Amino acid sequence: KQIYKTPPIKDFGGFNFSQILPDPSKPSKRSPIEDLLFNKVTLQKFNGLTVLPPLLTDEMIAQYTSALLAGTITSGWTFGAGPALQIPFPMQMAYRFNGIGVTQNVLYENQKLIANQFNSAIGKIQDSLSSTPSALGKLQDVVNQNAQALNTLVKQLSSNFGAISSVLNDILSRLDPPEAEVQIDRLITGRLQSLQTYVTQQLIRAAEIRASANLAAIKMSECVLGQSKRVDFCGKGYHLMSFPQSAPHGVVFLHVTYVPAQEKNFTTA
Amino acid sequence: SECVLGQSKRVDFCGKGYHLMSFPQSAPHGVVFLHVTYVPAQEKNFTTAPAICHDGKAHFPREGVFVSNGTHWFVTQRNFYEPQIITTHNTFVSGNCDVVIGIVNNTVYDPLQPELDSFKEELDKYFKNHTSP
Amino acid sequence: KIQDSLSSTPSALGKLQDVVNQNAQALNTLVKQLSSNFGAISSVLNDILSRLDPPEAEVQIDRLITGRLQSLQTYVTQQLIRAAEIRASANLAAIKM
Amino acid sequence: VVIGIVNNTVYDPLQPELDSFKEELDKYFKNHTSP
Amino acid sequence: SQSIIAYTMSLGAENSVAYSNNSIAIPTNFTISVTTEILPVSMTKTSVDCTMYICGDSTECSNLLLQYGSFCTQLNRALTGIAVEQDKNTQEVFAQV
Numbered sequence: 297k298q299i300y301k302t303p304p305i306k307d308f309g310g311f312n313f314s315q316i317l318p319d320p321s322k323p324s325k326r327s328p329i330e331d332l333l334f335n336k337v338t339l340q341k342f343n344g345l346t347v348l349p350p351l352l353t354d355e356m357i358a359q360y361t362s363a364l365l366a367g368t369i370t371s372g373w374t375f376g377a378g379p380a381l382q383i384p385f386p387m388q389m390a391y392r393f394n395g396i397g398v399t400q401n402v403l404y405e406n407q408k409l410i411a412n413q414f415n416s417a418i419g420k421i422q423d424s425l426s427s428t429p430s431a432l433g434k435l436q437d438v439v440n441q442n443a444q445a446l447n448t449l450v451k452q453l454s455s456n457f458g459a460i461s462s463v464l465n466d467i468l469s470r471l472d473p474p475e476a477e478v479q480i481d482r483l484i485t486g487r488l489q490s491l492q493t494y495v496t497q498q499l500i501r502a503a504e505i506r507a508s509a510n511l512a513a514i515k516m517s518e519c520v521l522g523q524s525k526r527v528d529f530c531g532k533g534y535h536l537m538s539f540p541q542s543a544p545h546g547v548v549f550l551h552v553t554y555v556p557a558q559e560k561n562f563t564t565a
Numbered sequence: 566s567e568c569v570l571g572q573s574k575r576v577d578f579c580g581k582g583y584h585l586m587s588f589p590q591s592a593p594h595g596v597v598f599l600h601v602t603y604v605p606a607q608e609k610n611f612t613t614a615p616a617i618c619h620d621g622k623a624h625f626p627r628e629g630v631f632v633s634n635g636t637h638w639f640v641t642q643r644n645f646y647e648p649q650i651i652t653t654h655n656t657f658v659s660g661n662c663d664v665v666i667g668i669v670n671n672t673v674y675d676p677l678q679p680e681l682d683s684f685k686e687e688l689d690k691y692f693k694n695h696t697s698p
Numbered sequence: 699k700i701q702d703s704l705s706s707t708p709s710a711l712g713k714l715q716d717v718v719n720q721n722a723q724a725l726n727t728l729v730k731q732l733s734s735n736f737g738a739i740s741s742v743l744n745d746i747l748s749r750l751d752p753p754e755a756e757v758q759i760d761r762l763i764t765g766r767l768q769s770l771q772t773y774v775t776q777q778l779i780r781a782a783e784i785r786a787s788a789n790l791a792a793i794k795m
Numbered sequence: 796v797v798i799g800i801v802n803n804t805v806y807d808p809l810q811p812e813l814d815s816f817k818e819e820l821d822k823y824f825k826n827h828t829s830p
Numbered sequence: 831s832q833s834i835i836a837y838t839m840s841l842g843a844e845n846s847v848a849y850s851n852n853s854i855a856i857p858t859n860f861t862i863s864v865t866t867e868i869l870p871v872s873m874t875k876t877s878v879d880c881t882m883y884i885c886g887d888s889t890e891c892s893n894l895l896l897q898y899g900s901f902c903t904q905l906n907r908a909l910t911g912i913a914v915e916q917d918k919n920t921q922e923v924f925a926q927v
């Protein structure tokens with residue numbers, strides 16, 4: 297309910313966030329990865345089929361996501377639970393390591409290496425998103441389903457449904473007021489059945505879109521605003537933190553996870 | 566199940582903030598919960614340091630964070646102000662002081678140190694007394 | 699004890715038995731629906747084709763076409779709803795795993 | 796009662812702190828016997 | 831003095847924060863607050879007699895209805911399933927002890 301604003305200084309102890317924090321040069325406060333997201337996604341009226349505009353505009357959604365990101369990177373998890381309290385980033389990350397059960401001296405002994413690995417990982421996902429297009433199928437599919445349903449609904453007006461002509465003006469112009477009634481009933485029944493089918497499918501689709509938005513809400517609350525102990529919930533492996541990013545008709549998370557790498561055999565008691 | 570029969574660590578699940586407990590209540594065709602939550606209220610700015618180097622070694626807090634008002638250094642809980650004297654039980658030693666970026670100079674006290682100093686003074690007094698007879 | 703208990707009563711696995719039985723019952727009713735007249739003079743298309751001249755034969759077929767199309771739509775809608783609950787249980791199972 | 800316990804010594808951080816004090820006390824006693 | 835106005839909605843009260851690399855804020859006092867939450871658990875049971883509704887107390891309309899197969903049986907089964915599900919919901923939510 298408060299829009300925290302990022303500090304002008306970018307001294308985070310070596311960590312680099314330029315690729316997730318919005319860039320003022322663009323007319324909209326849209327980050328670079330966000331721009332890749334909207335570029336990948338490729339987002340009737342005459343028959344009464346109208347489309348309405350959303351209440352929350354894309355700029356306001358960007359304002360929300362930027363406020364969330366700034367609050368996280370400045371204050372840890374406190375801003376979701378109470379009054380926001382500032383804390384150094386090099387201490388917040390040590391708090392996360394204490395959370396995952398690794399003692400805090402590791403950060404103070406490996407800060408530069410961890411920062412370099414973090415930045416390299418961000419660069420890797422930058423490249424992966426700029427390269428592959430099969431990632432955004434989970435959104436392109438919903439767009440395609442909606443377009444296909446509307447297209448078939450339009451196309452349905454061309455069928456006879458048992459009448460002598462598919463055009464309401466032709467039949468009304470060729471037949472008098474008496475026998476036209478027989479042909480006009482079949483058209484009404486057929487088109488009414490088509491509308492019923494379309495509405496029912498829309499009801500089911502909307503229910504699933506809502507179930508996904510509720511899962512997304514729980515993930516946001518439990519991953520971004522704090523640290524989650526659940527296994528394989530906020531990304532595979534040992535969780536540290538997360539970053540939300542907007543996208544057309546959706547949201548994209550960048551889970552940051554800790555994974556052990558190099559083991560050795562020992563003798564125990 | 567997750568709120569009434571126990572305590573849930575999930576953020577913003579059993580009420581907004583730091584959860585403590587809950588109460589169910591009946592209603593027509595439904596249920597109503599009375600979430601009871603803890604929220605911090607009044608904050609103050611302080612000066613901090615990631616580690617403390619006293620005998621050429623880096624000390625780190627076992628529990629709490631290093632805090633100072635400008636003249637003396639203490640450890641405090643995360644969510645409530647409660648200063649305490651820097652002692653051995655509060656800190657654990659690991660590594661050297663060079664790798665810690667932003668380490669801050671200060672002394673570190675040992676609670677065993679004055680207990681041993683009291684016995685040393687008693688022993689010195691006893692030694693001095695032993696020369697009297 | 700668990701092995702003995704599972705080997706004793708059959709009321710435990712009703713959760714999976716119902717998943718089988720609902721599908722079997724629905725498809726069985728779908729088959730049964732082919733025997734109704736739906737307002738026609740016969741339930742067998744071959745007979746309506748063999749009898750009558752080409753024009754009227756098709757008219758009776760339409761009554762049959764409308765009825766059977768309605769039956770198919772009903773079956774498909776019920777399947778869509780059932781699939782959603784099976785997937786909701788599958789998501790719960792994945793989270794528990 | 797524990798299965799597979801393995802023999803080894805267990806060390807004390809207080810033990811050398813008292814051992815150094817005991818050695819200092821012994822040296823002080825030796826010094827005190829000198830005059 | 832009252833009129834309909836139009837304005838760009840405010841996202842919220844703007845609040846800048848003072849980040850620094852060596853300062854922390856630690857709370858010294860707290861409040862205990864209690865907040866309510868409301869969830870529906872069930873809805874009213876309802877059963878509709880198919881033949882009564884469609885052909886109230888008329889033998890001719892009953893006979894004409896008999897041509898349409900098992901639609902009435904399907905509707906009765908569906909509504910009975912909903913009715914049982916409601917009691918299942920109340921049992922699950924409340925009977926935990």
Ligand SMILES: *[C@@H]1O[C@H](CO)[C@@H](O[C@@H]2O[C@H](CO)[C@@H](O[C@H]3O[C@H](CO)[C@@H](O)[C@H](O)[C@@H]3O)[C@H](O)[C@H]2NC(C)=O)[C@H](O)[C@H]1NC(C)=O
Pocket residue numbers: 312313314315328
């Ligand atoms: C944080 O990461 C940023 C993303 O990599 C990085 O910005 C990048 O900086 C380099 C070097 O300044 C730019 O590379 C270009 O730099 C100059 C610009 O005139 C050219 O002469 C070079 O030949 C090269 O083309 C990247 O373009 C730039 N990338 C982006 C997205 O801005 C920051 O420098 C990093 N900051 C810190 C403090 O680590």
Ligand SMILES: *[C@@H]1O[C@H](CO)[C@@H](O[C@@H]2O[C@H](CO)[C@@H](O[C@H]3O[C@H](CO)[C@@H](O)[C@H](O)[C@@H]3O)[C@H](O)[C@H]2NC(C)=O)[C@H](O)[C@H]1NC(C)=O
Pocket residue numbers: 634635636637648
């Ligand atoms: C920062 O916190 C320090 C510890 O809380 C505090 O030092 C303490 O200051 C008080 C005085 O306010 C001292 O109390 C003693 O003061 C006089 C000194 O002669 C005595 O006569 C009194 O009876 C009383 O014992 C504490 O002894 C002292 N403690 C320590 C460890 O130094 C600082 O004053 C605080 N500074 C700021 C700027 O807040």
Ligand SMILES: *[C@@H]1O[C@H](CO)[C@@H](O[C@@H]2O[C@H](CO)[C@@H](O[C@H]3O[C@H](CO)[C@@H](O)[C@H](O)[C@@H]3O)[C@H](O)[C@H]2NC(C)=O)[C@H](O)[C@H]1NC(C)=O
Pocket residue numbers: 621669670671
């Ligand atoms: C906190 O106490 C530390 C312990 O003394 C102190 O470290 C000391 O720092 C000085 C200043 O550099 C060193 O003095 C040496 O400096 C250079 C080495 O780069 C030499 O050329 C000089 O001749 C001189 O020998 C001390 O050696 C060093 N002491 C130890 C034990 O390492 C910190 O500086 C203190 N904290 C602050 C903020 O000053």
Ligand SMILES: *[C@@H]1O[C@H](CO)[C@@H](O[C@@H]2O[C@H](CO)[C@@H](O[C@H]3O[C@H](CO)[C@@H](O)[C@H](O)[C@@H]3O)[C@H](O)[C@H]2NC(C)=O)[C@H](O)[C@H]1NC(C)=O
Pocket residue numbers: 801802803
């Ligand atoms: C680690 O140290 C243990 C402590 O000494 C030691 O236990 C000792 O084991 C020997 C071997 O059995 C015992 O010796 C006695 O064994 C039987 C008793 O069952 C008698 O018939 C023998 O004549 C002999 O007296 C010691 O008594 C026993 N020590 C104690 C204090 O009970 C372990 O064996 C050591 N670990 C390993 C791997 O050897």
Ligand SMILES: *[C@@H]1O[C@H](CO[C@@H]2O[C@@H](C)[C@@H](O)[C@@H](O)[C@@H]2O)[C@@H](O[C@@H]2O[C@H](CO)[C@@H](O)[C@H](O)[C@H]2NC(C)=O)[C@H](O)[C@H]1NC(C)=O
Pocket residue numbers: 559560561
């Ligand atoms: C850890 O050791 C296993 C094998 O156990 C070893 O057994 C002895 C030889 C001795 O060295 C013990 O201390 C060891 O614990 C390794 O598993 C083997 O790996 C090799 C390939 O590296 C493979 O050919 C073998 O088939 C593996 N063993 C089996 C039983 O399949 C394992 O690689 C060691 N871990 C590391 C990190 O080196």
Ligand SMILES: *[C@@H]1O[C@H](CO[C@@H]2O[C@@H](C)[C@@H](O)[C@@H](O)[C@@H]2O)[C@@H](O[C@@H]2O[C@H](CO)[C@@H](O)[C@H](O)[C@H]2NC(C)=O)[C@H](O)[C@H]1NC(C)=O
Pocket residue numbers: 608609610846847848
């Ligand atoms: C905690 O500090 C912030 C800002 O830091 C302060 O900066 C100097 C003025 C100096 O006093 C430092 O020791 C402080 O830490 C305070 O936020 C400011 O609040 C005042 C009014 O309360 C407001 O006019 C300023 O604009 C605020 N600063 C910014 C950057 O917006 C904050 O109030 C301090 N907390 C407490 C409890 O006093």
Ligand SMILES: *[C@@H]1O[C@H](CO)[C@@H](O)[C@H](O)[C@H]1NC(C)=O
Pocket residue numbers: 307666667851852
């Ligand atoms: C904090 O940043 C200032 C510059 O803004 C720098 O001079 C100082 O060394 C930094 N301190 C730490 C502990 O990083």
Ligand SMILES: *[C@@H]1O[C@H](CO)[C@@H](O)[C@H](O)[C@H]1NC(C)=O
Pocket residue numbers: 694695698
């Ligand atoms: C010194 O030792 C004697 C015993 O030898 C004892 O009686 C006396 O109280 C001691 N004096 C002091 C000051 O401890």
Ligand SMILES: *[C@@H]1O[C@H](CO)[C@@H](O)[C@H](O)[C@H]1NC(C)=O
Pocket residue numbers: 798799
């Ligand atoms: C481990 O197994 C070996 C045999 O494979 C046995 O000799 C030994 O006692 C066992 N040790 C433990 C601690 O179980």
Ligand SMILES: *[C@@H]1O[C@H](CO)[C@@H](O)[C@H](O)[C@H]1NC(C)=O
Pocket residue numbers: 823826827
């Ligand atoms: C022994 O005691 C005397 C006290 O007269 C002191 O001057 C001297 O330094 C002591 N020697 C040692 C080695 O402690």
